Design a protein around this ligand. Structure first.
Ligand code: CLR
Ligand code: CLR
Ligand code: CLR
Ligand code: CL
Ligand code: NA
Ligand code: NA
Length: 542
């Protein structure tokens, strides 16, 4: 297969893939729309009781068999729909991740001047409601009336924004060239691309605290509200954010772990990566809410009403902070360069996983010698599918894709995989498999979370989400009926991959009765187990 080589290389490559735009762009606006401090307690509970155990499960699953997201299912051939749904979710995410990266590119290209274009209120696109520190904010007017030229409805396509299309093309070309010339795999300066963001965030942090009114923003960020805790909407949002930030059902974790050595310690790696990834979102939230408190202090409004609940909270808040620093364009350039690097690090692995999965699935040697053409085709398809998101109605489609297609399918897929491993294969067998590599049995906390706690929590969240479903409540953006139907279809497309592949496999399995056919399709194959011959001892002996 090809081992990773050095262990520190794996730890640094996993941190660079886990930390991305979901830490600095997605977390703050979800936290703001979920009433700030009322979102933190479910978030921490979810992280402690569902995220880390499933992260460890995925890493161990990848390491033990030395297979990717589709080859690990020799343990139960009837559950390949899990990997197929993982691939579907990865495609959905990667379609619009590059659109966000291209918006970041556009903001980076506009910082190469002497005076920032979002710093004053006298521009041709400004109105009489403009109000600036040297009502409405100049940054939000720049975001709405100039960068996007937003429409009034999701069904009003309007025209295509040419600069955004150019930025998208540049981003896709950069990704393709870096992938086919091997920038990260056989490359360095992953240390710098892991150290730079914290320096930038620390620089932005000191200025925010000094501001007037930031204390109220911080208090709103930290103070918990106990009234909104009895609602299934906030818990589902917290679970979605936790599973999205760690990449649980993306399929890249298994592929990355497939190159690890047998006796590598995946428990320590999982703990370290989870803590590092989740400690980065809190810093960005601190900075963002300090900026929000300062902004609400001088606009004569409350912290909960200063901004709207759209996805463009970062592109309105961060430029306002960047304005107040001495020599603003340099800091803006550095900040947006850091954002671009954070996005590209995740996009590289996202596309590499799909290409590797396709190449391994096809299986011949002719598809192995034409990997560059496969990568080119995938890149061209992604670029073509991302074009309708650069119109005047693109942010509506992006929001629909974000909070319908890649929110709660990850949790369902992860729970199904955990249940299949624990109750169809047997928990004792998996515990012995883990002890084979680590040398000690998994701690009791992970065992109890794998057998009882996490599946029950996910079941309760899913059950109470449906019962408490209100059309007025679960819309939040006044979308029409057909848009909601499209979002539901996108949500169901990845989940329905499991039951349909189950029937497909059952239609080709020998056995008189259906019960007999259900036992042959769930039995492990003949090649399940350790890859190397020296580790095939005990219950795997020939
Ligand atoms: C092959 C895949 C991976 C990348 C796609 C390459 C092509 C289609 C891309 C790369 C650079 C892009 C161009 C960059 C700049 C501009 C200027 C803008 O005013 C019109 C669009 C235009 C002309 C873009 C159109 C599409 C473009 C030519
Ligand atoms: C049991 C398995 C086989 C099927 C489960 C499918 C159902 C129950 C699940 C899968 C994904 C879930 C959806 C994912 C995302 C959203 C967006 C949210 O804004 C409204 C709820 C909604 C729409 C969820 C409702 C329930 C849902 C549709
Ligand atoms: C993936 C989700 C959203 C779809 C529904 C599947 C889950 C929630 C269901 C299907 C099988 C169920 C599990 C089957 C067996 C047991 C053993 C029991 O001692 C504790 C509950 C537990 C663990 C059940 C809890 C809920 C469960 C995990
Ligand atoms: Cl996060
Ligand atoms: Na990244
Ligand atoms: Na993350």
């Amino acid at each position: 297969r090809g081992n990773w080589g050095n262990q520190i290389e794996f730890v640094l490559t996993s941190v660079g893939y886990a930390v991305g735009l979901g830490n600095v762009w997605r977390f703050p606006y979800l936290c703001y729309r979920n009433g700030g401090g009322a979102f933190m307690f479910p978030y921490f509970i979810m992280l402690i009781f569902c995220g880390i155990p499933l992260f460890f499960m995925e890493l161990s699953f990848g390491q033990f068999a030395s297979q990717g997201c589709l080859g690990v299912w020799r343990i139960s051939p009837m559950f390949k729909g899990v990997g197929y749904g993982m691939m579907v979710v990865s495609t959905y995410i990667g379609i619009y991740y590059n659109v966000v990266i291209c918006i970041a590119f556009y903001y980076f290209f506009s910082s190469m001047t002497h005076v920032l274009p979002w710093a004053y209120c006298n521009n041709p696109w400004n109105t009489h409601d403009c109000a600036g520190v040297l009502r409405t904010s100049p940054s939000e007017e720049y975001w709405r009336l100039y960068v996007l030229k937003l429409s009034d409805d999701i069904g009003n396509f309007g025209e295509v924004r040419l600069p955004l299309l150019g930025c998208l093309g540049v981003s896709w070309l950069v990704v393709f060239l870096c992938l086919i010339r091997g920038v990260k795999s056989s490359g360095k300066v992953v240390y710098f691309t892991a150290t730079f963001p914290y320096v930038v965030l620390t620089i932005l942090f000191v200025r925010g605290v000094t501001l007037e009114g930031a204390f109220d923003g911080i208090m709103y960020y930290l103070t918990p509200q106990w009234d909104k805790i009895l609602e299934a909407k906030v818990w589902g949002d917290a679970a979605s954010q936790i599973f999205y930030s760690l990449g649980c059902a993306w399929g890249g974790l298994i592929t990355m772990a497939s190159y690890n050595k047998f006796h590598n310690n995946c428990y320590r790696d999982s703990v370290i990566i989870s803590i590092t990834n989740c400690a980065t979102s809190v810093y960005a939230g601190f900075v963002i809410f300090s900026i929000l408190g300062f902004m609400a202090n001088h606009l004569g409004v409350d912290v909960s009403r200063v901004a709207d609940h759209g996805p463009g909270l970062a592109f309105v808040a961060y430029p306002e902070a960047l304005t107040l620093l001495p020599i603003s364009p340099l800091w803006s350039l550095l900040f947006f360069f850091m954002l671009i690097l954070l996005g590209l690090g995740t996009q590289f692995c996202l596309l590499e996983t799909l290409v590797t999965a396709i190449v391994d699935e096809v299986g011949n040697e002719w598809i192995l010698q034409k990997k560059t053409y496969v990568t080119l085709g995938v890149a061209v398809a992604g670029f073509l599918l991302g074009i309708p998101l650069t119109s005047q109605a693109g942010i509506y489609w992006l929001l629909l894709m974000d909070n319908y297609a890649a929110s709660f399918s990850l949790v369902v897929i992860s729970c199904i995989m955990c249940v299949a491993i624990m109750y169809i294969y047997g928990h004792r067998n998996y515990f012995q498999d883990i002890q084979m590599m680590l040398g000690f049995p998994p701690p009791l906390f992970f065992q109890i979370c794998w057998r009882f706690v996490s599946p029950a929590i996910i079941f309760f969240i899913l059950v109470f989400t449906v019962i408490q479903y209100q059309p007025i409540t679960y819309n939040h953006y006044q979308y029409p009926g057909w848009a909601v139907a499209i979002g539901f279809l996108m949500a169901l497309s990845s989940v329905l991959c499991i039951p349909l592949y189950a029937m497909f496999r059952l239609c080709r399995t020998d056995g008189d009765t259906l019960l007999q056919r259900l036992k042959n399709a769930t039995k492990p194959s003949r090649d399940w187990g350790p890859a190397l011959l020296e580790h095939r001892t005990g219950r795997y002996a020939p």
